[PDB]
Design a protein around this ligand. Structure first.
Ligand code: HEM
Ligand code: HEM
Ligand SMILES: CNCCc1cc(C#N)cc(OCc2ccc3c(C)cc(N)nc3c2)c1
Ligand SMILES: CNCCc1cc(C#N)cc(OCc2ccc3c(C)cc(N)nc3c2)c1
Ligand SMILES: C[C@H](O)[C@H](O)[C@H]1CNc2nc(N)[nH]c(=O)c2N1
Ligand SMILES: C[C@H](O)[C@H](O)[C@H]1CNc2nc(N)[nH]c(=O)c2N1
Ligand SMILES: [Zn+2]
Lengths: 408, 415
């Protein structure tokens, strides 16, 4: 069936055909919707999946059923038959990575999807190799503040006992320390990871914003610690354009958001190590990272310096402080010429991106729960935009944390 | 389908277990290959006898289970009595006790409502003896006066006769009992509430003489027994309003904004045991954001962000200054302050979302679940600093329920 989606602000109606191509389940059924749930090979499995991907690749370059296409099918078939897997061509790898981003239903930044620098690291064999590759990624992506989207792809999974993994959840994150008095210093999101680094030999500064070491696992071996050279770690001290006292809060963040714990799937092949990076939407830092109760939780401190009456919730003192923090963050990044996008501009771009995809591609899978910003929702255009969510491959998937799997 | 489904709160780590979804009745619109969770809405004929029996039995069973008389003599007798009614008259009538139970539970089952901790405290007004629009007007006026209660608002529903053949429907044509007019101007601009321009035009055609102001309370347009609808003015003394002022910004009053105290939705259909109540206005009290974010700041509504921001002397040329966000917060601060000052019941979005979490938890424990639509439950501003943002929810449709129905002017056969 052709499915329609309406924008209730502009009354624009798009028609979705693309969803007809998905073959992977979403978690919902006819009788129960799980749209707010965060997470609901063999030779015989592998070839149909490879064939599907090869087919859409040669279809994408307008040479479906070509001599080259047919040969590739045969090439891939023989290679699965004789090795229980196959290797992607470089062109395929790049096409696959861009489309995993394209298909990422939860990403509001996908207007950029085809500007992705793809680093092929499939010849890597050791944690030291991974560290070199990651350093180059970071240096290239940071670009002195003029951030550039990139992904580095390490060797595919083989038998499951020789996985490459980046144990860090992002390449750059701050440590979190569980205090004697039961509280938390630094980032409470990373307390467990920090403890593993400590246990593995990392000597913690025990400050509020200590950059974590890289913890890297190659070919299924024990992971090894590495310090990212500090000149590669671009950071922004947070200040406020009106409140002189804001800089006295001591807040800072890092410029490069680079998620490193997801799994890239292309044509049935699994890439368990594929750190990918872009640039920040301000709310990621200013709302979630700084103001989640289970994160840096700074609302009370800021509201106090703002001298706001904090006794009753209906004074909306949290909401006032939230906006000012997010102002400061955008101002700080912009003053230091570090790429950042505000949630108005970002969501705006995403609506334009949806219109592009519906025209040229017949749809765009999108997850309203994640696309709508964590503040000021309904004064952004995506709030009023009906979206259809469905799962297309290639894709980025969640995977279990390595310390639950690995035996040393 | 699995017997136990789990939901997690990502802030508190609390994990709840849902068994109530097993009692789900109609489809959600999703399939296993697509999710329609952000779609707003995923023939003139009525239920046949065969369609009607199992729906009635289902409801009667559920009623007697609730009062701990399942399998009792009374239960079996009521079953038999209902069965005979349907067989000889192709429909049946609810007992008052059943009617009150069904109405309370349609609210309890309303996945999009954040206010459901209050569900058992609902004043049900039985208007199934109503025969004319004048009578509907009498019932609606009494409802408004009772629910308003001089500002100490009390939740209530008034239930007009159920549907019979579908050519004799009772309808309130208004979408809410109390709403403001909108008037499209020859030059393309709108006066009043742009959301209501269509309904307003209908009223004007029906004879209404419009004041043509910014906040003119609309007349009731009331359809009894399938007849042409009739106009009635609500006695202005029955319409509680709050002028919007600001605890710090003295100039805020000069904006001349006000809103009405009583949110009373009147265009939904109540379904109980396969019976359809097409006219069933229900009312509660407001969450601030319903007025301060949506009513006032939606672009296709009153759209006041700009004018407020200018009076705040904000720099408005760069979106990254968050002038919209800054203005939005102050507007919502004003609304809560004005209502509280005038002692009209209102709830802020922090308090409401916290109550709903406690409510949900209690429902999971005492009922085996609580259907919730995250896309509607999370407030239109400051989402993640409310506890519902981090709460996984399962959405599914239980009966009795409130349902959408077609706009009456689109279907009505004019006499
Ligand atoms: C270029 C600028 C980008 C911006 C502004 C952006 C923005 C965002 C935001 C705000 C989220 C929600 C994050 C959260 O709340 O945790 C997100 C999710 C996501 N992004 Fe993007 N993103 C960008 C680039 C990219 C790139 C380059 C990739 C991959 C090559 C990517 C893949 C993803 C994926 C897979 C998710 C969802 C992960 C999940 O399911 O948990 N994004 N993005
Ligand atoms: C008592 C105080 C109440 C509060 C604070 C409250 C709050 C809300 C809010 C904020 C919404 C979202 C509205 C929107 O964005 O359009 C909503 C929706 C809804 N409420 Fe409640 N509500 C209350 C009482 C009631 C009552 C008494 C009923 C019925 C007996 C009810 C039934 C519903 C239904 C059916 C919806 C969703 C309508 C739809 O699907 O479009 N509510 N409520
Ligand atoms: C409490 N937060 C946990 C939610 C989360 C989990 C995982 C994983 N695995 C991955 C996630 O990725 C979000 C993401 C991914 C990529 C991003 C890029 C490339 C840029 C950007 N600005 N934000 C991103 C944000 C998020
Ligand atoms: C502008 N978009 C309108 C979306 C909407 C449509 C319908 C219908 N039909 C009914 C709706 O009801 C929302 C609602 C219903 C009852 C409420 C009560 C009883 C109290 C309250 N504070 N808000 C309500 C809000 C909303
Ligand atoms: C497209 C989207 O489903 C639509 O804008 C919804 C989103 N969530 C909402 N949530 C509430 N409470 N009220 C609404 O009117 C809407 N509108
Ligand atoms: C329970 C709920 O699904 C969860 O809190 C989600 C809601 N929406 C989100 N949206 C974004 N962008 N990021 C998130 O981490 C979340 N968390
Ligand atoms: Zn769904």
């Amino acid at each position: 069936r052709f499915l329609k989606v309406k924008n209730w602000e502009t009354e624009v109606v798009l028609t979705d055909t693309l969803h007809l191509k998905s073959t992977l389940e979403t978690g919902c059924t006819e009788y129960i919707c799980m749209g707010s749930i965060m997470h609901p090979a063999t030779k015989d499995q592998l070839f149909p999946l490879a064939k599907e991907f090869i087919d859409q690749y040669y279809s994408s370059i307008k040479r479906f059923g070509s001599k080259a296409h047919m040969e590739r099918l045969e090439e891939v078939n023989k290679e699965i038959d004789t090795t229980s897997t196959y290797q992607l061509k470089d062109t395929e790898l790049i096409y696959g990575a861009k489309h995993a981003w394209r298909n990422a239903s939860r990403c509001v930044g996908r207007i950029q999807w085809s500007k992705l620098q793809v680093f092929d690291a499939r010849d890597c064999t050791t944690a030291h190799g991974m560290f070199n590759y990651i350093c180059n990624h970071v240096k290239y992506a940071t670009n002195k503040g003029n951030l550039r989207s990139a992904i580095t792809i390490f060797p595919q999974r083989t038998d499951g006992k020789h996985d490459f993994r980046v144990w860090n959840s992002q390449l750059i994150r701050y440590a979190g320390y569980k205090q004697p008095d039961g509280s938390t210093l630094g980032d409470p999101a990373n307390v467990q990871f920090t403890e593993i680094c400590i246990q593995q030999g990392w000597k913690p500064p025990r400050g509020r914003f200590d950059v974590l070491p890289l913890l890297l696992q190659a070919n299924g071996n024990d992971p090894e610690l590495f310090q990212i050279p500090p000149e590669l770690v671009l950071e922004v001290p947070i200040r406020h354009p009106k409140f002189e006292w804001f800089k006295d809060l001591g807040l800072k963040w890092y410029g490069l958001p680079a998620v490193s714990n997801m799994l890239l799937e292309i044509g049935g092949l699994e890439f368990s190590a594929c750190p990918f990076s872009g640039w920040y939407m301000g709310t990621e830092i200013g709302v979630r990272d700084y103001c989640d109760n289970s994160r840096y939780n700074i609302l009370e401190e800021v509201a106090k310096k703002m001298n706001l009456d904090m006794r009753k919730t209906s004074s909306l003192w949290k909401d006032q402080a939230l906006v000012e923090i997010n102002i400061a963050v955008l101002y700080s990044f912009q003053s230091d010429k570090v790429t950042i996008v505000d949630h108005h501009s970002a969501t705006e771009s995403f609506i334009k991106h949806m219109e592009n995809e519906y025209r040229c591609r017949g749809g765009c899978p999108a997850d309203w729960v994640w696309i709508v910003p964590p503040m000021s929702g309904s004064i952004t255009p995506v709030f009023h935009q009906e979206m259809l969510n469905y799962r297309l491959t290639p894709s980025f998937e969640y995977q279990p944390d390595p310390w639950n799997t690995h035996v040393w």
